[PDB]
Amino acid sequence: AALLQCTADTLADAVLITTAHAWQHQGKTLFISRKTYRIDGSGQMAITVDVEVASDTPHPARIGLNCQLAQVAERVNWLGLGPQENYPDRLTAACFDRWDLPLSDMYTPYVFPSENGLRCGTRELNYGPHQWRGDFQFNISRYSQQQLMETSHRHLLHAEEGTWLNIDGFHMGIGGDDSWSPSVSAEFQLSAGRYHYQLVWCQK
Amino acid sequence: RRDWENPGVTQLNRLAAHPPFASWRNSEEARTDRPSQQLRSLNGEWRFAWFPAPEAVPESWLECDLPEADTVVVPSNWQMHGYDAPIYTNVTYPITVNPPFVPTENPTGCYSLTFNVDESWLQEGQTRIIFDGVNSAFHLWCNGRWVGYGQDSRLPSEFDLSAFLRAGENRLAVMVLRWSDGSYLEDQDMWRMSGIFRDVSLLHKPTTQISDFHVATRFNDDFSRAVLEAEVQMCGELRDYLRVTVSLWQGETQVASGTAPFGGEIIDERGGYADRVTLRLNVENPKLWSAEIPNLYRAVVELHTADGTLIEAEACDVGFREVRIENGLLLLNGKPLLIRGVNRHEHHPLHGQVMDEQTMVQDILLMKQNNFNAVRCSHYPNHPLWYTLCDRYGLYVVDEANIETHGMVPMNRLTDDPRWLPAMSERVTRMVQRDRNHPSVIIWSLGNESGHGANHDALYRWIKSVDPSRPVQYEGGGADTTATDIICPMYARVDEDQPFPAVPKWSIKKWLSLPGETRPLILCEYAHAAGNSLGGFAKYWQAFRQYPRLQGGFVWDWVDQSLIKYDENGNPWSAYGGDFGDTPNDRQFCMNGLVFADRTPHPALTEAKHQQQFFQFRLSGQTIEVTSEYLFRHSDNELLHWMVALDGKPLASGEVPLDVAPQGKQLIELPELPQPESAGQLWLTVRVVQPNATAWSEAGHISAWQQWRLAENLSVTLPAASHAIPHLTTSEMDFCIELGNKRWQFNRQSGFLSQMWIGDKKQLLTPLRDQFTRAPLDNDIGVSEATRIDPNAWVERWKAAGHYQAEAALLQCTADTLADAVLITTAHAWQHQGKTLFISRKTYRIDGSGQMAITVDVEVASDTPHPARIGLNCQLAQVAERVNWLGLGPQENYPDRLTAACFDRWDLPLSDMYTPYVFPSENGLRCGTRELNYGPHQWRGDFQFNISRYSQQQLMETSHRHLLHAEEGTWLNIDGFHMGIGGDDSWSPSVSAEFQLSAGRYHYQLVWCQK
């Protein structure tokens, strides 16, 4: 990530942080992320994200935010599709409602570790003292995308300090027509070039 | 006898039907198809008088000219001359349904002609008169004596006048009835007219004559050899010295010839036909006929004596081709056809239903220039010249019987009634007897929209029996009955089933594989082109190319059936149903063509041309793969041009000769492309150009094209910040922003940008406000009307939800001063009767550069019908001459009809940004636009837009385009999103789900500044 802009403005009843980043690889600009963080008197942080994806780079696996929370709670409560793991092209069985599960159930123990546990069409997520609202997809666990990506067996995984949260505005399909050639249908590929999503973070 | 109210009597003393005759008395004339001294035209000025009924016609009219009659041109429709009104009705009959009766008030046209006849024509032989088309029934008198009667408005009626004529002057009297029992079989969706609308002529034949002849061509497996077989029939006295010689010519070269005396082979216990003979000619390596290469031979049939004295000669163009269905596929000369067809009615805005050579040629050229290779004669036999042109220019033709009983309840009430079998059979058999020698005709059709009756099965079998060289199709009763060799549905969709009871319209992909089905599927009608239509057209062609048995279809239809009328200032304007006082009527439903009545193209024509291309392309790296869809010809008049451009700015271009075999492929390696300096998106555009002119196209004709996005360089560099900082002036009623010579005014009560200034010049006439509706397209309206509302039609759903009445309620309007800009934030709620339909949240950011960045986020209640659009609109005070934009163009294009449009830098005069649909509606939209320029304004982003002198309101309230009045300034509609236009049909919702605005939440952003 290369910082292109970072400014702070004071509004009537809020502070406005504007940022812009460019992700590059060997001179090529893959993605551009422009955000605004508006923190008002009610203590809520409204995050606006607008991303640009070069039309000639392979469509990205996801478009969102992530971070490792210090908090480690027992439950995960959310108003969205559930209760089980569901992805864009595998979410017809999930139902929209208020779900509440222990953190461990938000992780799927696939023998061969990988991205897992996502829940789509979520309008509200609650974890510990935190509350996120909007319309996103998410997975939350004690394993970072990096560890899952480097570990060959699930029994070799180790809980990391705190909790890793991945909140996506968009996530690519998982496919499956077969597992030896690209099988994610075009309608589930992130090829729009320009994406927008908004999140409100606050204290439940 | 009131013969016009008896389906049992369809004619009296009419001669047998036969192929086109000219009775040449010189063989070379027949070979070269030059005019024949024995075939005279009686077209020109005739005498005409109108009467309210046949009972009002004075007997004196039979003996001499009525002084009150007028001199008029013939052929013609008398409604086009103003004697009475033309009636436009779709399904419902124009007369009370009480078969076989017609109204007592039956408009009667009394035609008469005083003409001269050479004595040589009466000293020997037979002189007959031919009426190519009389609508809808008539009696004929010659020199005061009754000659005959005839029905069926679309086929020639011939009578022997030999015993009624005298040398010198003669007078014909023709009483034409508008309505007859034949009218129950002519309920096609088109203007209802009448009169002698086709050619009238006199033909002289010898007493001993060729009375009929059939030409057939059989081939070996690889078509390297063929046998031409000609059955010739004669009338007159049989003599042993009589002979028939049939010669086949390839240009000026005779390639085959055969002679023989009359006397056919034994056929049954009583012998054979002594008055017939069949000649068989061998042809090695025949040049095959096809729409790709219309190779033609000339067959000359000579009736002569053994000593070599010619009696008479007849002839026809011959196209060596084989039509057959095998293993579920329609093949032409052994290859599977892909029908790029269209339905074409015989219509002229000035002459009504009278056809002329120039108009026919103009149609054929435009059709071929737009990649069509087939035409359906909806829904009757055409003017004889039409087939000759299709034979020579090369178009596959579906010849159809003049039989449509759409308005009956049920639809097959007459077609399943044996009492009507006689009338129906004649409409079928006489068509076959007339057109069977035309190579262009590859398929026979039993008629249109008359349900499915036993009479159809009978006539289907009759054709299969008399002419096994052509498939027979018929759509009635479900499109896949026992009366059709081809599944030929009308408006069946690609993926969506429409399970109507008894006569469902299955998805065409699904139809093919139903249990036990094996026939090929070709839509007799699809992609209803009413007004702003053809949305989803590309979906059809994708299926046609993927499924072997989906062999295409015929678009509905070719040309708008609008008629010309004149106002006070004598100015002409396009009229439709009801504009002649005709009532009841079906208003604008008579306009569904790809071109206007004067043959000017509708935007949709370009979409059809693109999807109907004969060359397909693929890109892999620096390699372009060109695949040919031609079945018989090589690309011997094609050149590929390629161009690479960065946001409209050309960087490199080139040309490569195309040399691809039919159904073959060619790989073209593009040279090393330079590296783009500036950021932006590189685009590759290729187009196939025909260097040489052809019979149907000029040199340089573009036949195909395709675009691809190449490398894209995202802009990361930031522009040098401006020293100037905008200033905010706050008042109770407004938020004003000043930046030097520029000012922005936001009304704090409305929450909208109400005015802009550049110096002291106002830039707006109407505030910039959100817009979620559009002046309804034909497809949005469907069959709904004020007297008969269709709650399911899109327009009715929007209206009932209050979309057109919704009022904006201001929820928030604030102003903030940033370090380098002024930020305006607004929020509006659109409600209707306590129901919030949409919520619009915006931010306007004005910086020192003078640019206003507008961000819009919209919420649409999931339970309100999906909106026609999500954008902004305003009336600019400026009226400029040009419109320049970087986006899809240059023609009008919509989400579900934009594959033909190309991304590039376009510049057009403001008038071309408006599409003159006869029935006004939303129009002129251009999608995928990143930059728009008009006068001092420039808008950047990723939007769709239209711009014109007509507000959506005026377009929505105006019934005819000639009543439109350019408003002050210029109306601009910039949409973040726009709904598809649809068109699979125009009487039910047809916009596919992927093109409906159902996401619930939408986001778009624009930057407004000066160019």
Ligand SMILES: CC(C)S[C@@H]1O[C@H](CO)[C@H](O)[C@H](O)[C@H]1O
């Ligand atoms: C009015 C429909 C229910 S029937 C529909 O009307 C169309 C009007 O262009 C065409 O005539 C179609 O062939 C016909 O089936």
Ligand SMILES: [Mg+2]
């Ligand atoms: Mg009759």
Ligand SMILES: [Mg+2]
């Ligand atoms: Mg009809």
Ligand SMILES: [Mg+2]
């Ligand atoms: Mg394309």
Ligand code: NA
């Ligand atoms: Na892994």
Ligand code: NA
């Ligand atoms: Na096909």
Ligand code: NA
């Ligand atoms: Na019509």
Ligand code: NA
């Ligand atoms: Na060529």
Ligand code: NA
């Ligand atoms: Na209108």
